[PDB]
């Protein structure tokens, strides 16, 4: 039922991401967050994270930093709601950090410093909200992946950015 | 030849400065690549120089150095200007340069470097202006259209509006 509503949102969200329609991407992800927030079930959040993951992936490979920010903002909102309502939110936290990882690697290889900063920032805030050893572990690996890709490509700014985020995740723990 | 190895030694210095962000050493090396091609006078030296330019611009873009990307784009224009004066059939040089400006603009747009995308569009226009052939105009419009569709997917209204103005001037200055 609400699975059908999200699947209709997924079609419109992905299509706007392929063409670069940042306004439609923003409103579809907003609708997807509302469907999961009204349902309140764990499956509704995971289905909404799947739409977020695919949109953020296309937006990152297209270089649309705005659509990346909106996707990762909704992904963070889903983690926030899951940490208050879902009994075992560790699966939702895994899905969100995986979506952040793909954005981070795509931006790091292309050299999109701004998209790297956002992905590293979101990984930092997801680890702070969850506060679990698994969330910190996955967040640091996202930072480690960006650092390795950036050092190989000689992107000093992305290396320095991953430097600061790694320390801030450590101090949060 | 020996010039193929002299250009490769210049590309090594130009790539290192592109990784480091030393935009002044990138420009100096690319000028030496232009001078090595100028003293040769053969179209194969100009083609190898364009490949040095293309390879340097991509490394600089992935390294997060937009100024080294823009200086590399400007050298590709000077290579066309030098090839127009010497080579009998510079159509192969112009085609390789316009496709090099295209691939660099695509990497620049996917990296969020809006200004490097603007410079690439301005270089495509000047290449069509200098080449003066109807083939080069068609190929320059194809580069601007490709960059426009890439910028549209990147959600960059600035580059789309800039490609719209460039595409108009290329049609007029023909």
Numbering used by the authors:
A (entry chain B): 3 to 175
B (entry chain A): 2 to 175
Q: How is this structure described in the published paper?
A:
The backbone conformation of the DHR serves as the first conformational state of our hinge protein (“state X”). We solved crystal structures for two designs, cs207 and cs074. For design cs207, crystals were obtained from two separate crystallization screens: one screen for the hinge alone, and one screen for the hinge in complex with the target peptide. In the absence of peptide the experimental structure agrees well with the state X design model, and the structure of the hinge-peptide complex agrees well with the state Y design model. The crystal structures of hinge cs207 in both designed states demonstrate the accuracy with which two very different conformational states of the same protein can now be designed.
